[PDB]
Amino acid sequence: MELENIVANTVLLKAREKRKGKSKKWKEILKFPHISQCEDLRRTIDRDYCSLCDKQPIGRLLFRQFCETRPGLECYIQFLDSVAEYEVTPDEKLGEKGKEIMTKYLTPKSPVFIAQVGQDLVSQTEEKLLQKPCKELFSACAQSVHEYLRGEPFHEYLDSMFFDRFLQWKWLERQPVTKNTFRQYRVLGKGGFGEVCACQVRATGKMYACKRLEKKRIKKRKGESMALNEKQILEKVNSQFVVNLAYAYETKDALCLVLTIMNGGDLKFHIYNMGNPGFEEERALFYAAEILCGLEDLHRENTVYRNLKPENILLDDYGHIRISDLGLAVKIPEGDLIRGRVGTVGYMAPEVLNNQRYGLSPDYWGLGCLIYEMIEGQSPFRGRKEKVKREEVDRRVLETEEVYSHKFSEEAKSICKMLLTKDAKQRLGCQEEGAAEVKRHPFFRNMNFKRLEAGMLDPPFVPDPRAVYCKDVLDIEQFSTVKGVNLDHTDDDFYSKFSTGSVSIPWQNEMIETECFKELNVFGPNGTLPPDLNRNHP
Ligand SMILES: NC(=O)c1cn([C@@H]2O[C@H](CO)[C@@H](O)[C@H]2O)c2ncnc(N)c12
Ligand SMILES: [K+]
């Protein structure tokens, strides 16, 4: 054993597990400013109910905490809470759970009666329950509450100390980010214009992955628009099955993307470096399902992926997966095809190999490639450790057909062949339906996709927290030192557009997840103004 490899992992493992890894002076770094400092944000902030009272996590909790100071509003908060529970109760007990809400919030004499719904809607919703139990029964009811809360309660909240406190939180959110903000750990993988390594916010202790983009390498390969495009894409998409962007900042030599940390490792590692090649169909099915949902979300914005291979699918602490490395994705102009000779050897669709125009098709070619590789333990057109000059592997993708073995079930064999059709016109999922045609394939007969997208399905494989499911730090491919490049001011503009600092919603989740919001979000005794919110004197 090499000690660089042992030490690198034990350090990463220690951080991953007092103070939850926070800094000693974290209460000073995240000290609220006096409200008198937040007048600029008070003007800039758009006064939108959905954003300030729901979408933004810390805003959501502060509005709820404000409504809980009034019995006349605490009921509405309890209704929206109960509706959420009803929306995740089993179809078996839906009918029952639907009766408590009605008998507890929707009766003239109920203890927590909410009156702003409408005597017509309560009855309209009352008949719906005798018809059939449905998780979307109270959709109109909960909406009627949002129509009332966004009126007077919202404007009363904007006048209260809780919204002032929100501005204070927003003042910290705006603070600049630098290399100081994080502490870097071992490298987890080579990719793109730099390397991916684990990092940790010093103030909060939350673990992330830092995808480094070396400045000298972007200029030398003219990948500037490609790096920027990756950043925007990661920002626009908000899917449970795609790496989420939390920060994007600049350093003297590189641009950095702070992404969700996936301690479970990539599927390429779980396919080849953990026992026999591939794994059981059960695992492939679950993963194929989540990948489908992740592709479905990327396709809603009409954005192709083109980069689907096992090393770009990752595993989190619980066993779920996310798609990573969106650097090859582009948003499509509606009704047009793109020419791009991009992709990985043995993972490019027949359309891309002929330098031919294509659309959303190459993604479903990749989905089939992954299902096959997970089950068979090898690429559909390349051996496990077989040396082929690119020219032939390419040929095989176009000319030769894949071969299946006893490892494949009838349904697994069927979904693969239907996803691995050379003619993109008659390829599964590439029809006008989109991912709907794929969700119905017999392969997904016991997979309740609606229940998967919610998160009520337990992953089949749970990674052990005290294991690093990755190659050792000294076995990671490295780059060659870039030479002859000098960073000019012409690129200072691109660096500025990229480095936009922290992303609001993820940042707020960081403060909530690490309990920083819990410990710091306090007020005076008896619910009085604390000094940082008192306008008489600091
Ligand atoms: N791009 C990313 O978000 C990530 C890439 N890797 C590793 O880097 C490899 C790709 O170079 C993958 O196979 C993983 O082992 C990651 N490992 C952990 N978390 C992440 N967010 C990533
Ligand atoms: K395996």
CATH number assigned to the domain comprising residue 270: 1.10.510.10
CATH number at residue 124: 1.10.167.10
Separation of 390 CA from ligand 2 center, angstroms?
26
Report how far apart, in Å, the C-alpha atoms of 276 and of each of 164, 314, 378, 466 are.
58, 19, 11, 22
Q: How many domains does the chain have?
A: 2
Q: Which atom of ligand 1 is nearest to the CA of 265?
A: 15
Say if 312 falls within a structural domain: yes
Residues with C-beta less than 6 Å from any ligand 1 atom? 188-191, 196, 209, 211, 243, 259-262, 266, 268, 311, 314, 324-325, 470
b/e burial code for range 116-153 (CB count within 10 A of at least 16 → b): ebeeeebeebeebbeeebbbebbeebbebbbebbeeeb
| Domain-terminating residue out of 464, 486, 507 | 464
Say if 484 falls within a structural domain: no
Structure tokens at 442: 């017999």
Contact 453, 240 (CB under 8 A): yes
How many residues are recorded in the chain?
A: 538
Choice from 190, 195, 239, 266 to test ligand 1 binding pocket (greatest atom count within 8 A of CB): 266
Choice from 16, 185, 187, 196 to test ligand 1 binding pocket (greatest atom count within 8 A of CB): 196
Separation of 370 CA from ligand 1 center, angstroms?
17
522 and 432 within one domain: no
409 and 318 within one domain: yes
Resolution (A): 2.6
**β-strand partners of 255:** 213, 250
Of residues 340, 334, 258, the one with CA closest to residue 303: 334
430 and 307 within one domain: yes
366 and 286 within one domain: yes
453 and 525 within one domain: no
- Three-state SS sequence of 127-187: HHHHHCCCCCCCHHHHHHHHHHHCCHHHHHHHCCHHHHHHHHHHHHHCCCCCHHHEEEEEE
282: amino acid identity, one letter: E
CB-count burial class (<10 Å; 0-12, 13-18, 19+) for 323: buried
CA 473/CA 2 separation, integer angstroms? 10
413: amino acid identity, one letter: K
At 323 the three-state DSSP class reads strand
Place of tokens 């069927």: 414
| Domain-terminating residue out of 422, 442, 464 | 464
Choice from 314, 316, 476 to test ligand 1 binding pocket (greatest atom count within 8 A of CB): 314
Q: Which H/E stretch holds residue 97?
A: helix 94-105
Torsion over CA: 235, 508, 239, 380 (sign): positive
- Beta-strand ranges (E) seen in 260-319 are 265-266, 303-304, 313-315
339 and 272 within one domain: yes
Contact 106, 113 (CB under 8 A): yes
Separation of 79 CA from ligand 1 center, angstroms?
41
365 and 445 within one domain: yes
**β-strand partners of 475:** none
Separation of 327 CA from ligand 1 center, angstroms?
13
Question: Which ligand minimizes its atom distance to the CA of 279?
Answer: 2
**β-strand partners of 249:** 256
Question: Which ligand minimizes its atom distance to the CA of 476?
Answer: 1
CA 536/CA 514 separation, integer angstroms? 33
Q: Which H/E stretch holds residue 191?
A: strand 182-191
- Closest residue by Cα to atom 7, ligand 1, is 189
Q: Which H/E stretch holds residue 95?
A: helix 94-105
- Closest residue by Cα to atom 13, ligand 1, is 311
Choice from 188, 316, 370 to test ligand 1 binding pocket (greatest atom count within 8 A of CB): 188
Separation of 278 CA from ligand 2 center, angstroms?
5
Q: Which H/E stretch holds residue 11?
A: helix 3-16
Separation of 324 CA from ligand 1 center, angstroms?
7
Q: Which atom of ligand 1 is nearest to the CA of 191?
A: 11
Q: 94-105 and 71-86 helices cross at what angle (nearest 10)?
A: 170
Question: Which ligand minimizes its atom distance to the CA of 377?
Answer: 2
Say if 76 falls within a structural domain: yes
Separation of 312 CA from ligand 2 center, angstroms?
17
151 and 82 within one domain: yes
| Domain-terminating residue out of 442, 464, 486 | 464
Say if 504 falls within a structural domain: no
Question: Which ligand minimizes its atom distance to the CA of 310?
Answer: 1
**β-strand partners of 331:** 303
CA 278/CA 368 separation, integer angstroms? 15
Separation of 254 CA from ligand 2 center, angstroms?
36
Contact 364, 427 (CB under 8 A): yes
Name 176's Cβ contacts closer than 8 Å, sequence gap at least 6.
501
Q: 94-105 and 119-131 helices cross at what angle (nearest 10)?
A: 160
167 and 285 within one domain: no
**Which structural domain range is residue 332 located in?**
265-464
- Closest residue by Cα to atom 10, ligand 1, is 189
Question: Which ligand minimizes its atom distance to the CA of 191?
Answer: 1
162 and 303 within one domain: no
CA 370/CA 32 separation, integer angstroms? 48
Torsion angle defined by CA atoms of residues 11, 17, 20 and 23, in that order, rounded to the nearest 10 degrees: 20
The DSSP code sequence of 425-460 is: GG-TT-STTTTHHHHTSGGGSS--HHHHHHT-S--S
Say if 315 falls within a structural domain: yes
Angle (CA) 124 139 154, round 5°:
110
Order of strands across the sheet that contains 245-250: 182-191, 194-201, 207-214, 254-259, 245-250, 501-502
163 and 270 within one domain: no
Say if 227 falls within a structural domain: no
396 and 269 within one domain: yes
Say if 112 falls within a structural domain: yes
**Running DSSP on this structure, what letter comes out for residue 244?**
P
CA 339/CA 347 separation, integer angstroms? 17
Say if 105 falls within a structural domain: yes
CA 400/CA 408 separation, integer angstroms? 19
- Closest residue by Cα to atom 9, ligand 1, is 189
Contact 506, 16 (CB under 8 A): no
Q: Could you tell me how many helices (H) and strands (E) the chain has, helices first? A: 24, 11
Please give the backbone phi and psi of residue 160, each rounded to the nearest 5 degrees, phi first.
Answer: -90, 170
